[PDB]
Amino acid sequence: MNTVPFTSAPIEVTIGIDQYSFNVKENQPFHGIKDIPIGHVHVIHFQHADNSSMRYGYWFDCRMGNFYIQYDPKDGLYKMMEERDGAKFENIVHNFKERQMMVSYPKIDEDDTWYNLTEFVQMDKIRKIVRKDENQFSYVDSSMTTVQENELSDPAHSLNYTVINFKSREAIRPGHEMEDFLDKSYYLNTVMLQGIFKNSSNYFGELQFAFLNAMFFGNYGSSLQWHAMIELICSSATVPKHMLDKLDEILYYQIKTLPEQYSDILLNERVWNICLYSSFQKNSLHNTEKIMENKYPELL
Amino acid sequence: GAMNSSNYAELFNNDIKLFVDDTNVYRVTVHKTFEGNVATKAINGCIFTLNPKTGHLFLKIIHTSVWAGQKRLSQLAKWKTAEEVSALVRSLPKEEQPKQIIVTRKAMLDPLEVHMLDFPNIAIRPTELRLPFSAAMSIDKLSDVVMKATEPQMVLFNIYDDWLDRISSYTAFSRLTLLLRALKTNEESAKMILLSDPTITIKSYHLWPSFTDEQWITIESQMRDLILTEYGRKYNV
Numbered sequence A: 001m002n003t004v005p006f007t008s009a010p011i012e013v014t015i016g017i018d019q020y021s022f023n024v025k026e027n028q029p030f031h032g033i034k035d036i037p038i039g040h041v042h043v044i045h046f047q048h049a050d051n052s053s054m055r056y057g058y059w060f061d062c063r064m065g066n067f068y069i070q071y072d073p074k075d076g077l078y079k080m081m082e083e084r085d086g087a088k089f090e091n092i093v094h095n096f097k098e099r100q101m102m103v104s105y106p107k108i109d110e111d112d113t114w115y116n117l118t119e120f121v122q123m124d125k126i127r128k129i130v131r132k133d134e135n136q137f138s139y140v141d142s143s144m145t146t147v148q149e150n151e152l153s154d155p156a157h158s159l160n161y162t163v164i165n166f167k168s169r170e171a172i173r174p175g176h177e178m179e180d181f182l183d184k185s186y187y188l189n190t191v192m193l194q195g196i197f198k199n200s201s202n203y204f205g206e207l208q209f210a211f212l213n214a215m216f217f218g219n220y221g222s223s224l225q226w227h228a229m230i231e232l233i234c235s236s237a238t239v240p241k242h243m244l245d246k247l248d249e250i251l252y253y254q255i256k257t258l259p260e261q262y263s264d265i266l267l268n269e270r271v272w273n274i275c276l277y278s279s280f281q282k283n284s285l286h287n288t289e290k291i292m293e294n295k296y297p298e299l300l
Numbered sequence B: 001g002a003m004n005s006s007n008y009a010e011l012f013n014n015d016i017k018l019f020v021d022d023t024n025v026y027r028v029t030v031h032k033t034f035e036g037n038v039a040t041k042a043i044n045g046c047i048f049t050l051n052p053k054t055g056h057l058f059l060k061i062i063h064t065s066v067w068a069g070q071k072r073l074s075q076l077a078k079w080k081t082a083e084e085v086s087a088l089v090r091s092l093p094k095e096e097q098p099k100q101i102i103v104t105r106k107a108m109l110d111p112l113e114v115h116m117l118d119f120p121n122i123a124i125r126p127t128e129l130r131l132p133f134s135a136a137m138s139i140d141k142l143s144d145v146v147m148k149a150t151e152p153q154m155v156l157f158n159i160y161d162d163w164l165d166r167i168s169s170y171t172a173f174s175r176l177t178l179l180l181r182a183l184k185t186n187e188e189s190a191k192m193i194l195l196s197d198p199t200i201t202i203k204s205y206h207l208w209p210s211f212t213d214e215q216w217i218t219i220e221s222q223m224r225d226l227i228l229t230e231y232g233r234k235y236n237v
């Protein structure tokens, strides 16, 4: 069980760690988060009390280094940093734990939620979507645009999700225009899975990462990507059975975790109605259809 | 974006553009079977592709053999239309290719967009105008070539005959749409108007009769009256 210490908390802020969150008051004696489960990526995220604008945060994996948070009064945010001195770090953590200045990652033992949301998400793939190679952790905020959003403006601060565009030469074989547009199996299986992602695990990892960026930072481009990757599968007549069954599990836990009060903005009515009721896979997503119909029957 | 009354003069500027109307591509007669069910029989159709500035009409005849063994023919017809328009563009010299293609039905937008991906600089546009191009098969010489076709065929016409020697393309288009609207609203009466006088004939190389300027004013008035007459008969006014 690993630890992310905080140097201090000089400004009032709501701090998220994965699907949990807690409020810290201005100059409260808060020195970090302990008991973080090893084996998963994690995200530590922030919303300042005095300016809700720019929810931002850091994706990290405690197996890759010792990370801590320190407020920067010049740039006005909580920054993640790596401590290379292992003995310095162990000594800082132990002192803060002894003084009980840390919140405990509050995982219920029965609860597989975070695993289910990050099953296919790997740090190495996050760091290719979010390019900042001198850090082992990845910064994401509310306003960062995607490579596709920029094509339709700073490239170093972009989310390099895989571009999906149903009306593009990549998606449409010359001479198979009608076939490929109405049945996207070629695009899914040859172009995307065999060609770009290599396997369904990397595809699901990007899908899951896009969802989590939408939920945690209100990143519109991330939501656009999440929906595009669902639609591409649902609009394919030929999908491996194991992918459909896994997709149903992935989406079920995403819909289950979504704050009820942000359904209006996080869920695209067209995509979901198409996917659940018109698409080739309208009958393949039983768990997802059931939770959507009982939780968000308005959208449908 | 879409083409409407506000930007109507754009049709007659010097940027090459084509209207595409797919309403006569897939044509059927519905009939009873011996067992008392219903079946369709396809008949030859056509794509109506028109340059409104010059009157050049690219009439691609759709022979019933293209439907043989195919399913979901109303959907296929839109994609076949887009395929044939794309093939026409590719067949034209670069300096004759359109800069815009305006589809008369919004359901042609995605099929044509997808078929024209190789031409990102050609705009594919809808229109808010209700154009009467479905009535093209009320023009006897066009109906005749479509029905006689035994194989796929493209036939080129000028739908304005020689009108542009005497009038502008704005006026020619207005005349054409009035004629077609009349043929669409009451075909029998419209054709009566157009031929009632045997001394005015259709030249071998034309589609419409050889009316003088003064005779066109009379004809045009008679077509407006017909459209108004039918509008009253319809709504009881």
Ligand SMILES: [C]N1N=C(C(F)(F)F)[C]=C1[B]([O])=O
Binding pocket: A213, A214, A215, A217, A218, A219, A220, A221, A223, A265, A266
């Ligand atoms: C505030 N916000 N949140 C989202 C989403 F990520 F949940 F999809 C989109 C927007 B927006 O339009 O600015």
